[PDB]
Design a binder for this molecule. Structure first.
Ligand SMILES: Cc1cc2nc3c(=O)[nH]c(=O)nc-3n(C[C@H](O)[C@H](O)[C@H](O)COP(=O)(O)OP(=O)(O)OC[C@H]3O[C@@H](n4cnc5c(N)ncnc54)[C@H](O)[C@@H]3O)c2cc1C
Ligand code: XAX
Ligand SMILES: O=C(O)c1ccccc1O
Ligand code: FES
Ligand code: FES
Ligand SMILES: [Ca+2]
Lengths: 1225, 67, 30
């Protein structure tokens, strides 16, 4: 009794007879229509990997329009008579690439490639609306698109070349969906069924259903109704039907602002400001005005502005019609509006501003919670005619309570007062009082939020006043780049499903530390297509897993973090597995939990004892020092945010325990080992294949196996192929991240700035198993010197054992942590001594031939030339002057500049992992297939390996090919890690080539003018084998702690970065203005790959140090589980000027063709933004705080807007502006 | 498979046991040459021991063989 | 050392059970 759903994809008609309202367009494209170019990266609207173009008729506005949307939030039931275009839709390597696809690929804009299709579709959509866009439009187009690899620079450079009706009924398994064609039909429907839920854009509802497990068994979509879509210019303001997209609201209001007089458009420009950095295009194209309003989020950016301005709401039910201005009574409680259950919001009139009426809007440049504690506001003042005397005042704030509120007491007291200093004082006092937060108020950041309520008003108060009075060495693009841009590159979940293939959903601990009392599955057993539930009892081999045999495959008697895997559900579709998992009832008995580093130090909960490197005589160095500074420092962790999350397919053959797996991993050997150990089967039975990863970053070196083992078990149990791909929220919760570090330190120095003694005790938060924590701590200790000679030095480290997901490798592997701790105390030495930072860093540098604190010698120490050249090209000394000039001429905005070096040790710190295998075949057509132990994750290792094989063999690259990595071609491989993959695999590929060349030598002698093909065929026919292994092992490695000698590293990669920032001292926001990097990568095999690596790495570092903040409940539950609450760098995050140079004339005698590892060494240079920011904070504190020029103030990482703001101590932070006593002129 | 062993003659002429027998034997010998130093250090050890030790000493445990 | 021993075909038990995979026994993609 349901109507047929009919739409179009890439021009082809789709007729769906049994359309289920719960089906997203992304699930239908990938799993019904076999178009896998469009990706899942989050499922929540933040990342854009799932972008498509939608095309539909506005009957009203009378035209076919083209917009971008997130496929992951679009229900197919909204798509009746809509046309969809995917990346497959605009071109292909099979036919011919669209110019967009080709350009992103040739410009080096694609590394891993997983983001590239979403991005191609964002750019494609812009070009169909505007065939000649500006650079601003291009940039805005990419707002809702995230990339983890590239640093964005190349995509923008690349694309800059372009610049300058009857009711329908659908019936699902749970949901009945009605598409309403008329207003009348809506009201009747709402009257027959008051509980029925409206859905328009689905960008809120979709999240409630997916993430918060709500189920609305009746949905009415009223998007077709003309009255819900009208735009009407009236004499009071501009009315918008409640279904109007935010993009349409924005279009109209911008048209009104350019046309009408300034004085009429104050409200309008408020709405526009709130809409600026609001999601991206894909969301604004689908999100309705009315949906935002009725959602009534405490952190709605719109509702404070509508409340402040008395925006009119026309509200309707069958019979009833009424218009009210939005005021404080509109939101009576949490997520509620003053509407009756029958009632629906019809339109919204956004008023013109009057004479003597002024408006501002502001929002907090940070969000850390799903729906609370992000400050946002609309402010309105109306004066008596021609005067400065207050007649009306409205200050309405989100994120200061569980609903949008208005500061009524405060504003009331201002009536008839004049707009002056006293007024400012009275309002700030009102505000601090009326909006006061108890110290344990949900959301935290109490100080920062109070200070923002007041600083926002100060901006309004100042604004109102103003209103009155051989290819080696060649820039070869990634070999997969084109197919990555075309959506043709295969990633693990792009592999077709077998007819009998099943799906797995992890079942996860909701408690930090607890006994498992019972597990009940009877409600999961009722989900359609449930196959089975798996737990510890089902394992045929061993439940003992992990790098140090201290983990369970499945939890047994207790759980030890939130996300501790307990079991798994297997079902016939992934939605079925997802549903049935959320319904598995687990009964717990809480145990005492240990969460923070501090919790752990106080309870002595550690893995092992302290590690230590010590050299010199500390109680003596401190004797000789003129100056001794002690302190404590914290650095928060980081999520990998690989655009492709964890994924495994396991295929049980049914013979002799055989299993073939396809997996998103850096470590095929351990995946194989772990799978076999769990199964109780020899390693020779198990085959693991890796084509590519859509990102790794250290996060798929070991923790990939959490999914793999589980999936393989389901494959063993059921005997069907099984697969699982993690959602983003699962991925961030279970798989662990970068290690948070705590440091307590003490430096002894002279008045010159010469260091003479250092001790640092480092503590990492290692989480609920060992994993790579110990080696991570070792690498931290090897780097606590950065580039500096320290005669007397003691570094300890301790691994904190905690009820958190087990943390793991992350690009840098403990290095960034200790290098940051190191740049910190260096910064305090320069300030304390009253000398320029760059003079202090310079004087304390190692020289050629110096020995580290672990006694390794530094030969080819290139930091001096990197430094000298970075100073020169960045015009450092001139710009420094200009920063001082800026800071003397500006009160509430400050600039900051910093230049900082890096040294990063190259090799695995466990000697045995510095080995590598290759396997080379030459077929009788001369075509060569290379296989080696490395995996491709976007860093372009295969491209480099192709380039090396080609040089070595003296044949064009076109004759060489690499397909994939597999455990049956090269066994016992180390993980693709520690930046050495190009060194060690290149060497082994090189040896295999040499072996093949020596074998062809005699056929070469017999026919010196012969082609390669002739020689190969002559050697085949003479029965000379054309297949060989190659092998390499890094010589002279083996550091000893007990003797503190022998080489920990093969060589060191060096670099230097300069960064300039401007902070907003009233809000803690900042802009990255300019960064110059000079990097020593020896002689590069591929300048483009290597510059790509410097850039991507630098921007992952600037994330770590400034933007990325993970946040947990006191009970240890991760709160930031997606792009909405966790902020990785975005297109608009990178420095306006971003220059990277590779040092000329510096070959490396240690590695393949004089090249140097580049993957991880440049990530630390990201910290130049942090220390530039801190430099800006110093000037802000010299401005408003005190007069001590040598003041050491602590600043932890990440320097978010909260920490930057709270550190700009002033009359607001202190509350002196209220008339109180505090600290500040 | 063609990605493990390439350019193979068809399984024919009754010679397979003969020629692949020799090719398997030769590869087995190369392994034993590589494992001999670890045998001599620990004559009372197991197969498993010699293998782990060779791996940890970064000796390749993969080889081709040919006849 | 089994050379010269009448050891049964290694795959013979799976062949008798239906378990030994022949080309058409490989499952089809959807
Ligand atoms: C990635 C992303 C970023 C975002 N960023 C921001 C941001 O920065 N600032 C901000 O304020 N918001 C932000 N949002 C929230 C977003 O603006 C809202 O989700 C959106 O406006 C809701 O409209 P919709 O049409 O999708 O509503 P739906 O999800 O379809 O419905 C939302 C709710 O409104 C009800 N409803 C809808 N229309 C009516 C009607 N006319 N009458 C009565 N009830 C109705 C529905 O029943 C439902 O309860 C963001 C959302 C996403 C996904
Ligand atoms: N685009 C892209 N670039 C990337 C990676 C990625 O996933 N995607 N990851 C890093 C890491 S993190 Mo680690 O030591 O396992 S902590 S080392 C490492 C490095 C591994 O690649 P080689 O340079 O050895 O070939 O690649 C870097 N560059
Ligand atoms: O020393 C390293 O950099 C390292 C990296 C990955 C795994 C183990 C290790 O010792
Ligand atoms: S997957 Fe749709 S926005 Fe991330
Ligand atoms: S290339 Fe953009 S996420 Fe990897
Ligand atoms: Ca750990």
């Amino acid at each position: 009794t349901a109507d047929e759903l009919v739409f179009f994809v890439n021009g082809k008609k789709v007729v769906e007879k049994n359309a289920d309202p719960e089906t997203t367009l992304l699930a239908y494209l990938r799993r019904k229509l076999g178009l896998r170019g469009t990706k899942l990266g989050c499922g929540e609207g933040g990342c854009g990997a799932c972008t498509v173009m939608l095309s539909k008729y506005d009957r009203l506005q009378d035209k076919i329009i083209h917009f971008s949307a997130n496929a992951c939030l679009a229900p197919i039931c909204t798509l009746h008579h809509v046309a969809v275009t995917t990346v497959e839709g605009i071109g292909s390597t099979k036919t011919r690439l669209h110019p967009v696809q080709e350009r992103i690929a040739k410009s080096h804009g694609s590394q891993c490639g997983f983001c590239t299709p979403g991005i191609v579709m964002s750019m494609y959509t812009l070009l169909r609306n505007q065939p000649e866009p500006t650079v601003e439009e291009i940039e805005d187009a990419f707002q809702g698109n995230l990339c983890r690899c590239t640093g964005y620079r190349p995509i923008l450079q690349g694309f800059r070349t372009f610049a300058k009706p009857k009711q329908l009924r659908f019936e699902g398994e749970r949901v009945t969906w009605i598409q309403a064609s008329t207003l009348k039909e809506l009201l009747d429907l709402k009257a027959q069924h008051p509980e029925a839920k409206l859905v328009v854009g689905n960008t809120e509802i979709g999240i409630e259903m997916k993430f918060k497990n709500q189920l609305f068994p009746m949905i009415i979509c009223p998007a077709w109704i003309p009255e819900l879509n009208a735009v009407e210019h009236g004499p009071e303001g501009i009315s918008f039907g409640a279904a109007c997209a935010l993009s349409s609201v924005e279009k109209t209001l911008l048209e009104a602002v350019a046309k009408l007089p300034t004085q009429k458009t104050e409200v309008f420009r408020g709405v526009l400001e709130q809409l600026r950095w609001f999601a991206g295009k894909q969301v604004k194209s689908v999100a309705s005005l009315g949906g935002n309003i009725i959602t009534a989020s405490p952190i709605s950016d719109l509702n404070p502005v509508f409340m402040a301005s008395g925006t009119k709401l026309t509200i309707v039910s069958r019979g009833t019609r009424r218009t009210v201005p939005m005021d404080h009574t509109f939101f009576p409680s949490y997520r509620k509006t003053l509407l009756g259950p029958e009632e629906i919001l019809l339109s919204i009139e956004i008023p013109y501003s009057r004479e003597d009426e002024f408006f501002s809007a502001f929002k907090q440049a940070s969000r850390r919670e799903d729906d609370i504690a992000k400050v946002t506001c609309g402010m309105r003042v109306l004066f008596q005619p021609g005067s400065m005397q207050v007649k009306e005042l409205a200050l309405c704030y989100g994120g200061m309570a569980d609903r949008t509120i208005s500061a009524l007491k405060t504003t009331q007291k201002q009536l008839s007062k004049f707009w002056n200093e006293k007024l400012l004082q009275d309002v700030c006092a009102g505000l601090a009082e009326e909006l006061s937060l108890s110290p344990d108020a949900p959301g935290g950041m109490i100080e920062f939020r109070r200070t923002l309520t007041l600083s926002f008003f100060f901006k309004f108060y100042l604004t109102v006043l103003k209103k009155l009075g051989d290819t080696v060495g060649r820039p070869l693009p990634h070999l997969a780049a084109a197919m990555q841009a075309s959506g043709e590159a295969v990633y693990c979940d792009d592999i077709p499903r077998y007819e009998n293939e099943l799906f797995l959903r992890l079942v996860t601990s909701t408690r930090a530390h607890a006994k498992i009392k019972s597990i009940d599955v009877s409600e999961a057993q009722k989900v359609p297509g449930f196959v089975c539930f798996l737990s510890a009892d089902d394992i045929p081999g061993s439940n003992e897993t992990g790098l140090f045999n201290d983990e369970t495959v499945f939890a047994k008697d207790t759980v030890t973090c939130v996300g501790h895997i307990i079991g798994a559900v297997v079902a016939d579709t992934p939605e079925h597995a997802e549903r049935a998992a959320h319904v598995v009832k687990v009964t717990y008995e809480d145990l005492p939990a240990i969460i923070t580093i501090e919790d752990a130090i106080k309870n002595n909960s550690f893995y092992g004892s302290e590690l230590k490197i010590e050299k010199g005589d500390l109680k003596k160095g401190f004797s000789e020092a003129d100056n001794v500074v002690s302190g404590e420092l914290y650095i928060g962790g980081q999520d990998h945010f690989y655009l492709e999350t964890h994924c495994t397919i396991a295929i049980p053959k049914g013979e002799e325990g055989e299993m073939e797996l396809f997996v998103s991993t850096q470590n095929a050997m351990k995946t194989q080992s772990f799978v076999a150990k769990m199964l109780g089967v020899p390693v020779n039975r198990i085959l693991v294949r890796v084509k590519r990863m859509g990102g790794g970053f250290g996060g798929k070196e070991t923790r990939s196996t959490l999914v793999s083992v589980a999936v393989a078990l389901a494959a063993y149990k059921t005997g069907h192929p099984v697969r699982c791909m993690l959602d983003r929220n699962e991925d961030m919760l279970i798989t662990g991240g970068r290690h948070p570090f705590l440091a307590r330190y003490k430096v002894g120095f002279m008045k010159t700035g010469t260091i003479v003694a250092l001790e640092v005790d480092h503590y990492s938060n290692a989480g609920n198993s060992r994993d790579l924590s110990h080696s991570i701590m070792e690498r931290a200790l090897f780097h606590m010197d950065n580039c500096y000679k320290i005669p007397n030095i003691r570094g300890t480290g301790r691994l904190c054992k905690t009820n958190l997901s087990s943390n793991t490798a992350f690009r840098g592997f403990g290095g960034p942590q200790a290098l940051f701790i190191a740049e910190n105390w260096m910064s305090e030495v320069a300030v304390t001594c009253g000398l320029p930072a760059e003079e202090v860093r310079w004087k304390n540098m190692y020289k050629e031939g110096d020995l580290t604190h672990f006694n390794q010698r530094l030969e080819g120490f290139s930091v001096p030339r990197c430094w000298d050249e970075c100073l020169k090209s960045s015009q450092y000394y001139a710009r420094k002057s200009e920063v001082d000039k800026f800071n003397k001429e500006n009160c509430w905005k400050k600039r900051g500049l910093c230049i900082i070096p890096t040294k990063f040790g190259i090799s695995f710190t466990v000697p045995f992992l510095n080995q590598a295998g290759a396997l080379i075949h030459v077929y009788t057509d001369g075509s060569v297939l290379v296989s080696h132990g490395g995996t491709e994750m976007g860093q372009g290792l295969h491209t480099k390996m192709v380039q090396v094989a080609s040089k070595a063999l003296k044949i064009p690259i076109s004759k060489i090919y690499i397909s994939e990595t597999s455990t049956n071609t090269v066994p016992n491989s180390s993980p693709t890690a520690a930046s050495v993959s190009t060194d060690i695999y290149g060497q082994a590929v090189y040896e295999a080539c040499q072996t093949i060349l020596k074998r062809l030598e005699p056929f070469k002698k017999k026919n010196p003018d012969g082609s390669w093909e002739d020689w190969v065929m002559a050697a085949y026919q003479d029965r000379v084998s054309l297949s060989t292994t190659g092998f390499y092992r890094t010589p002279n490695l083996g550091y000893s702690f007990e003797t503190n000698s022998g080489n920990a590293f093969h060589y060191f990669t060096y670099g230097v970065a300069c960064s300039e920032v401007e902070i907003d001292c009233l809000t803690g926001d900042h802009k990255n203005l300019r960064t110059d990097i000079v990097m020593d990568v020896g002689s590069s095999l591929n300048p483009a790959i290597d510059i790509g690596q410097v850039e991507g790495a630098f921007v992952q570092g600037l994330g770590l140090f400034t933007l990325e903040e993970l946040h947990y409940s006191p009970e240890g539950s991760l709160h930031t589980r997606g792009p909405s609450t966790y902020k990785i760098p975005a297109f608009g995050s990178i420095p306006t000027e971003f220059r990277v140079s590779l040092l000329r004339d510096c070959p490396n005698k240690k590695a393949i063709y004089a090249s140097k590892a580049v993957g991880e060494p440049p990530l630390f240079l990201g910290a130049s933004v942090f220390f530039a920011i801190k430099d800006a904070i110093r000037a802000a504190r010299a401005q408003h705080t005190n007069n001590n020029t040598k003041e050491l103030f602590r600043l932890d990482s990440p320097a978010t807007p909260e920490k930057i703001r709270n550190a700009c101590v002033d009359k607001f932070t202190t509350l002196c502006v209220t008339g109180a006593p505090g600290n500040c002129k």
